[PDB]
RNA sequence: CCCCCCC
RNA sequence: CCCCCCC
RNA sequence: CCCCCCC
């Protein structure tokens, strides 16, 4: 059945159309040196409103890939959003859907903070501490990638995890910019990813275009590391299933587990059939996701969760254990094997 | 014989003609923003009559796919129903076959409820609690998809299951709209699916056009999840047969089971021959369904039902057990293997 | 005739 | 319906 | 995020 369902979904002669009357903003590569400034003036000043930081990160992505490539990416993502270009005025940027009041506020706040830290201090600002640093857009996109790995999770868990992991992953940027509010920027990125779902596809295309590069700075290598940490998002049950098989859990040989193993292997075969893009299904909110669910094998899922709980892997996972006796037996065996 | 029967049914040079003098209603995409309102004014008010909620969900489907694509879908489903377009009047909708009194009643009831909940309360209605929310048509179609998975079952079982599953599947919508009557909407959808059988084909085409989409909201992902839960409808005996084979039931090696295994494998080969569209045969009430029946293998069916009963899968399945001795032996072995 | 559980 | 830990 | 010794 599962192969037939995927065959129906894949073999479609008709293309969906959505967001027909909508538009979005991009910034041409000719403005990259400008957007960098903006992407850094968000980082070293303490701003009251961090509402469009995610849009500025996506603007930098658009400068990197190019306006035409970004339009093509949005078009092949199933969304008929018409790209609107970015202009300059007196210079500053007039990004579509980003209020000019916001851009002026961010610029003025950063200029005032820079003046205050230059007047009082000894005037020895290093090359990495200024807003026009060239890795500041990647530093913002690193907060974006941290909150990207938690798009399958909830908002509160995502924000808490983003802040906790960014105090260590982004320690160097925090030292360079003492006053960068990872919570508010992470909230902005979560809002962008939820509202504009095609920007998930744009962000993934940037991740690919960055990982495929021949050279990169440490910021881009960090961004790619986090982006790849997001790969199996929304499918931790499959990873824990292969973990359970590697652990040689005895309760995998139970009668009901052996009964469901056929369709479990069917799900894994479907994973292989989709191939490399299967991992990005839940990150993209591809409607085709959910063909990879193991919820139709309650006993296998309970055994997998029990094995994870025994090994300590389960952590604070919020999934359901359908069959509690199998869960407890598997947990006991996994603890025994671990000890 | 079974391959020959399918060859006769498939190799037909003549097309059937039905519903020749009949007509049905569609709504053009230009009215989607309007139909959404209607599809949500059914959800947050307590209506005396929920008679045409299913037709309003199908109207939203018609806006999504388009009027011309919907006409083509109805034509290729074997039904010569002439599509009638939807108009507006003073604005509200005049849907063909939907009485204007009903639309006026629903709109007035929703407006009165909104006025009552705005006058008494503190006036802090969130963006998701209002009728013009853009996921309300998908919320109605989710009740429709829940009752869709029970079209092979009976009406009472379908309604009971729809309400039971919708208290959990649709918990968030229920929180957003405290007064949405899943029983009456489910009854309306069951009535639509029984009366207009071509709307099963339309609803399946919407499911495909939604699953094939590159992006979607959580409502559309939920709808696709339920729609795929409906895939093997009307053929639980085949699923339980492959379950029995996976369980390695000893009574499958009995003399009579081994006698019938040849034509059983013939049925499964026919399943593979039809391919992806085989699962939707009973959902569509395709007359070609019934070639997949295992009723001509009473001993295999009894063994399969016994295995299911032993594993606890049988639940409250109402199929017949032809050979009770095989059923009991298979149930005993399945319980023994499970323990 | 067929279908019939749970998710 | 699905998802849900850590890195 | 990754890396981190010796030759």
Residue numbers in the entry:
A (entry chain E), B (entry chain C): 10 to 99, 112 to 360
Task: Give the original sentences from the paper that presented this experimental model.
The nucleocapsid is the template for transcription and replication by L, which is also dependent on the obligate polymerase cofactor, the phosphoprotein P, together forming the active L/P holoenzyme. An important function of the C-terminal domain of P in nsNSVs is to bind to assembled N-RNA, forming an N-RNA/P complex.
However, 11-mer oligomers (black arrow), 12-mer oligomers (white arrow), and short coil-like segments, denoted as spiral particles, are also present in the preparation (red arrow). Finally, 3D-reconstruction of the spiral particles yielded a coulomb potential map at an intermediate resolution of 4.7 Å. The map density of the spiral particle shows N protomers forming a spiral staircase and stacking up upon each other, in a mode reminiscent of a helical assembly. The map is most reliable in the central protomers and becomes increasingly disordered towards the outer protomers. As the map quality was globally too limited for atomic refinement we restricted ourselves to rigid-body placement of N-RNA protomers. Thresholding of the map at a low level indicates the presence of additional N protomers, however, this density was too diffuse to fit more copies of N, presumably due to heterogeneity of the sample or conformational heterogeneity. It is notable that in this arrangement the RNA strand is obscured by N protomers belonging to the next turn of the assembly, suggesting that a conformational change is necessary for the genome to become accessible to L/P. Taking together our cryo-EM reconstructions, we observe that the lateral interaction of RNA-bound N protomers can support a range of geometries, demonstrating the plasticity of N-RNA and supporting the notion of a highly flexible HMPV nucleocapsid.
